[PDB]
Design a protein around this ligand. Structure first.
Ligand SMILES: CC(=O)N1c2ccc(C(N)=O)cc2[C@H](Nc2ncc(Cl)cn2)C[C@@H]1C
Length: 126
């Protein structure tokens, strides 16, 4: 079975927390990015089988996607904002590592990342 298991969105052994920053990441940051015209490739784990990209998970060993981030936030999976911001950064970095510059998916990621950075700049104080 060529796809790996997706990243966990819950873990009963991982301490859970709600902070005003994590509330902002779900209510403002994720919601803004999720509805974007370019969001759809990022809304679920890369299906490297269906995309016929057998090398994707040979190259990308820390996969991440906004579907996973959305469920982690809804589940209060995170302890802090940094864990969630790290997942967004991983999602973007994976896209830039795997794909060639100028690819449609790269321009799409760049547009979402510019919007992500705008919203992260307005992160409230804890
Ligand atoms: C996120 C990422 O790097 N990739 C990805 C993931 C999911 C989906 C998809 N079809 O859901 C598609 C892609 C990318 N392919 C693509 N082709 C055309 C357009 Cl208009 C947008 N993307 C490749 C890449 C592995």
């Amino acid at each position: 079975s060529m796809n790996p298991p997706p990243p966990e969105t819950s873990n009963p052994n991982k301490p859970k927390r709600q902070t005003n920053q994590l509330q902002y990441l779900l209510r403002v940051v994720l919601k803004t990015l999720w509805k974007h015209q370019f969001a759809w490739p990022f809304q679920q784990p890369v299906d490297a089988v269906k995309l016929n990209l057998p090398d994707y998970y040979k190259i990308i060993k820390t996969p991440m996607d906004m579907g996973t981030i959305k469920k982690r936030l809804e589940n209060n999976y995170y302890w802090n904002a940094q864990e969630c911001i790290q997942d967004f950064n991983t999602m973007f970095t994976n896209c830039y590592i795997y794909n060639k510059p100028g690819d449609d998916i790269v321009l799409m990621a760049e547009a979402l990342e510019k919007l992500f950075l705008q919203k992260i700049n307005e992160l409230p104080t804890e």
